[PDB]
Amino acid sequence: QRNEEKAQREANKKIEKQLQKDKQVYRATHRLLLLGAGESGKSTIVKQMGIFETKFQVDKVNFHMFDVGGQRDERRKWIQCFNDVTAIIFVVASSSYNMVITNRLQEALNLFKSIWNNRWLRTISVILFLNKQDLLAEKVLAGKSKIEDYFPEFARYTTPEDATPEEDPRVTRAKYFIRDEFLRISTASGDGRHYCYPHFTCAVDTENIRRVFNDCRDIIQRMHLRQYELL
């Protein structure tokens, strides 16, 4: 009677003391979601620098990434669980305009549009990696394949003046056209609540973790600035 009540309170105090230590670790870590178009080469990006999870730390900051391979369907009912993540990483193979496999770039664009316009992912940014740049450069330098045959809008495109090519002008024009194809979808739907950070990625890059770190820093800083009515 009297002794039982005190016994219960003893166990509650021990449990509540453990939950305080767990809250410190939980609030100091950042969660990322990794997506792909099906044959985009996202496995290599993970390898170099049900559900698969990985942990890494840069500049004494803890990150923790999620990859889903146990579920493969055109309907993503589980996508509503990832509405508290810091950012989403989207990997797309940019050198697959001619591969019907209806081509894979159009499917990737449709997937990006579906993810962007979602009732739950309305405040989440996307870090976009445009993988397989060397293959794209080689195929563009090859005269046989023409993007305008598959993408008719390419017949009336010019390289932007405010560009930073390294490179023959043809491959730069192709890369910027492909990047703009995603940017035009990104800009229209959202208004300041989230942004997109496109990057050009290859199989020999080792600075991708720095890019993720900087993009997350920008995401949090912009979130705070918008919250304090300064942006």
Partner 1 sequence: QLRQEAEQLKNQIRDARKACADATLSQITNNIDPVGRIQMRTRRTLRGHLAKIYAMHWGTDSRLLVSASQDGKLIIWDSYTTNKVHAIPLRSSWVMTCAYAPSGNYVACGGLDNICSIYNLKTVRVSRELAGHTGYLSCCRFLDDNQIVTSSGDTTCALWDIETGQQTTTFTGHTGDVMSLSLAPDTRLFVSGACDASAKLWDVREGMCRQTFTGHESDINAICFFPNGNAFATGSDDATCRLFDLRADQELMTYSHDNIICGITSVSFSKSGRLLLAGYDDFNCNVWDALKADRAGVLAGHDNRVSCLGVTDDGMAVATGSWDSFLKIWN
Partner 2 sequence: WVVGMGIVMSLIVLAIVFGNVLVITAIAKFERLQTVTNYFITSLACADLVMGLAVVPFGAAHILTKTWTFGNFWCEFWTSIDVLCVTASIETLCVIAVDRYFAITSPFKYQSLLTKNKARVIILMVWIVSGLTSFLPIQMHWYRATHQEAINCYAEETCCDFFTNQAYAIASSIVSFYVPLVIMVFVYSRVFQEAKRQLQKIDKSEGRFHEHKALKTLGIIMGTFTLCWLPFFIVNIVHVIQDNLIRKEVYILLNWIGYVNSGFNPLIYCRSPDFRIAFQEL
CB of 91 to ligand GTP, least distance (A): 7
Q: Which is nearer to partner 1, 72 or 144 (CB)?
A: 72
CB of 8 to partner 1, least distance (A): 5
- 31: number of Cβ within 10 Å: 14
Specify the DSSP element, H or E, that contains 18.
helix 2-27
- Edge-first strand order for the sheet with 87-93 is 51-58, 61-68, 29-36, 87-93, 125-131, 196-200
> What are the angstrom distances between the C-alpha of 90 and each of 30, 160, 165?
17, 24, 23
132 near ligand GTP, rule: CB under 6 A: yes
Angle between helices 133-141 and 169-189 (to 10 degrees): 130
Segment contacting partner 1 by CB under 8 A, of 4-12, 34-42, 167-175, 179-187? 4-12
28 near partner 1, rule: CB under 8 A: no
Rg value, the chain, Cα: 22
The burial of 97, by beta-carbon neighbours within 10 Å (0-12 exposed, 13-18 middle, 19 or more buried), is given as: buried
CB of 200 to partner 1, least distance (A): 32
CB of 175 to partner 2, least distance (A): 15
When binding is defined by CB under 8 A, the residue of 48, 78, 168, 220 that contacts partner 1 is 78
Binding-site ranges for partner 1 (CB under 8 A) = 5, 8-9, 11-12, 15-16, 18-19, 22-23, 26, 50-51, 68, 70-71, 73, 75, 77-78, 81, 84
Binding-site ranges for ligand GTP (CB under 6 A) = 36, 38-44, 131-132, 134-135, 202-203
